[PDB]
From a paper:
Zinc RING finger 3 (ZNRF3) and its homolog RING finger 43 (RNF43) are trans-membrane E3 ubiquitin ligases that negatively regulate Wnt signaling. ZNRF3 and RNF43 contain an extracellular N-terminal protease-associated (PA) domain, a single pass trans-membrane helix and an intracellular C-terminal RING domain with E3 ligase activity. Interaction of ZNRF3 or RNF43 with complexes of frizzled receptors (FZD) and low-density lipoprotein receptor-related protein (LRP) 5/6 leads to Frizzled ubiquitination and endocytosis of the heterodimeric receptors, thereby reducing the capacity of Wnt-driven signal transduction. RNF43 and its homolog ZNRF3 have been identified as E3 ligases that ubiquitinate Frizzled receptors for degradation, whereas RSPO1 captures ZNRF3 for removal from membrane, thereby increasing Frizzled expression on the cell surface.
We co-crystallized ZNRF3 ectodomain with RSPO1 consisting of the Fu1 and Fu2 domains. The ZNRF3-RSPO1 complex reveals an extensive interface, burying ~1,200 Å2, between the two molecules. The interaction site on RSPO1 is formed by the β-hairpins 1 and 2 of the Fu1 domain, which form an extended face that contacts ZNRF3. Apart from some side-chain rearrangements, no major conformational change is observed in ZNRF3 upon binding to RSPO1. Four copies of ZNRF3-RSPO1 are present in the asymmetric unit, which are arranged as a dimer of dimers. The dimeric arrangement observed in the structure of ZNRF3 is conserved in the crystal structure of ZNRF3-RSPO1; the two ZNRF3-RSPO1 dimers contact each other sideways through H-bond interactions made by the β1-β2 flaps of ZNRF3. In two copies of RSPO1 (denoted chains F and H) the Fu2 domains are less well packed and display higher B-factors than the other copies (chains E and G); these two sets differ by ~20° in Fu1-Fu2 domain orientations. Gln71 and Gly73 residues are located on the ZNRF3-RSPO1 interface and the Anonychia-related mutations, Q71R and G73R, would affect binding to ZNRF3 due to steric clashes and electrostatic repulsion. The structures of ZNRF3-RSPO1 and LGR5-RSPO1-RNF43 show that binding of ZNRF3 or RNF43 would disrupt the 2:2 LGR5-RSPO1 complex.
Residue numbers in the entry:
A (entry chain E): 36 to 145
B (entry chain A): 57 to 208
């Protein structure tokens, strides 16, 4: 730990990595081994989404499976081709209950 | 209220036997949690790592030992959670124990030991000085480590 912090990082730690990013940038928590370190990014990597906060910009891991872009960690906005989107989640087949079926791609009725 | 912390590094041989290497360091049990023994896989948590929505970042197998290096209070003017809040969150997320590094934030000790509420069912331990530096050195260098918290 012989050098200053990272490019877009204004508050740094040896252990914790980056603590605070430049206002435009996003902080992302990277788990490498035991360590969890802050890292400053211009954009969120795939798997993560753009959690737009008034206090800190975060890249948050999406937890929904077969999802390419999610509104939150458990709600999904768009599902990978060619899966159907029921209540925030992705399915290879519309769940049991009513269903879209063109119905362009989102499962309604309930 | 002394807590003995053993950090265990382990390696597997082809045969199937485990070789271990252990180092000791000391801390104190805090009133935030029970004064019980605990053992578990070490997981370092970033300050922001126990915050809202980030919590559900990843899932760990139940029974991990959270390790948190606290920053100087000016570097964290807007904490998402109190230290107690962080401990509680960690335990809710399957921590068998929580260890705080309070060298840069000694004041946190007072926040841990002086709480109006029910102490957690799991141990909350803090470390400082050479012990904290030792623990952090292990955390930084090693890929995997098991922690054993002993006494009282």
């Amino acid at each position: 730990g012989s050098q200053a912090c990272a490019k877009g990082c204004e508050l740094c730690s040896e252990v914790n990595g980056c603590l605070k990013c430049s206002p435009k940038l996003f902080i992302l928590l990277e788990r490498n081994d035991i360590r969890q370190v802050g890292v400053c990014l211009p954009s969120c990597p795939p798997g993560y989404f753009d959690a737009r906060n008034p206090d800190m910009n975060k890249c948050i891991k999406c937890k929904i499976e077969h999802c390419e872009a999610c509104f939150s960690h458990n709600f999904c906005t768009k599902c990978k081709e060619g899966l159907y989107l029921h209540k925030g989640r992705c399915y290879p087949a519309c769940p049991e209950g009513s269903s879209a079926a063109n119905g362009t791609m989102e499962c309604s009725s309930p | 209220e002394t807590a003995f912390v053993e950090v265990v590094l382990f390696e597997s041989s082809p045969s199937g036997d485990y070789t271990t290497h252990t180092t000791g360091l000391t801390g104190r049990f805090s009133r935030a949690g029970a004064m019980l023994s605990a053992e578990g896989e070490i997981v370092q948590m970033h300050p922001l790592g126990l915050c809202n929505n980030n919590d559900e970042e990843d899932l760990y197998e139940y029974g991990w030992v959270g390790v948190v290096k606290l920053e100087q209070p000016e570097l964290d003017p807007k904490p998402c959670l109190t230290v107690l809040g962080k401990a509680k969150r960690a335990v809710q997320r399957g921590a068998t124990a929580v260890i705080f590094d309070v060298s840069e934030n000694p004041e946190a000790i007072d926040q841990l030991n002086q709480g109006s509420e029910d102490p957690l069912k799991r141990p909350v331990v803090y470390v400082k000085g050479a012990d904290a530096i030792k623990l952090m050195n292990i955390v930084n260098k090693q890929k995997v480590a098991r922690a054993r918290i002993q006494h009282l």
